[PDB]
Amino acid sequence: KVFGRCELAAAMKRHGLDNYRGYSLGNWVCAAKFESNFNTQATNRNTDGSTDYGILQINSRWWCNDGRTPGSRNLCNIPCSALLSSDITASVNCAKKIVSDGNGMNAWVAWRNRCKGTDVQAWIRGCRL
Template sequence: MRTQSLALLSLSLWVIIISSSFDAVLSKRYMRCELARKLLQQHGFERSLLPVWICLLEHESDLDTAKITANPNGSSSYGLFQINTRYCQQDRRGGVCNIKCEDLLDENLRESASCAKRIQTSEGFRHWNGWQRYCRNTQNLPNLKVICGI
């Protein structure tokens, strides 16, 4: 009986270690310039809008792909772009962007970037509170040309 308990405890510890390692691989907290380059080069974001996106993402998610926010209206917002549950569905593909909300937490930004651009095209940056509070004023935007050489 004691041997079984010890074996179960050992197995549980391995599951925890593997799970925490797995999460660390999937999520990421970006540095400002690293993210700006990735959005520009790999995801086709417009260079002229890049300072707005970086400001927005710094205030919405602190550049962390693993961020989940519970909103006062009962919805949640996921990932780097803090995409609301009306654009994704938990546990299966769905919503306006036809994606799983959990996929928005991945450091691979393909689906989250595509959905964010779709939201911005249809609703503008006003969709995000971070833009309304902090990034609407162009004086608050980072000068990526000076800071990052972009």
């Protein structure tokens, strides 16, 4: 599924991500924009053999099982394919665990490099929420 910007904002709010761990909804929308361009089916292979999955590009090295990432963990206790669904629930629940792991949203390199410290409210501007 390719979400619209306000559509994704609304779904993220519906699943409790707005202001989760102190990160406003604009931060989460911005992260999704630059991680996946709002496409739930986005997958990207990393140099080390792991893969990033879904709207928030969650990595099989730690967070989900894809059966092809040797010596990795599955800390969200889900198949990585669950992070590709049109319903964002599994990606949101896993992202809640990731952003609680110690480094906040810095876990998302595109957030740090493209969203952090910018006017992230622009991502929700005009949305009926």
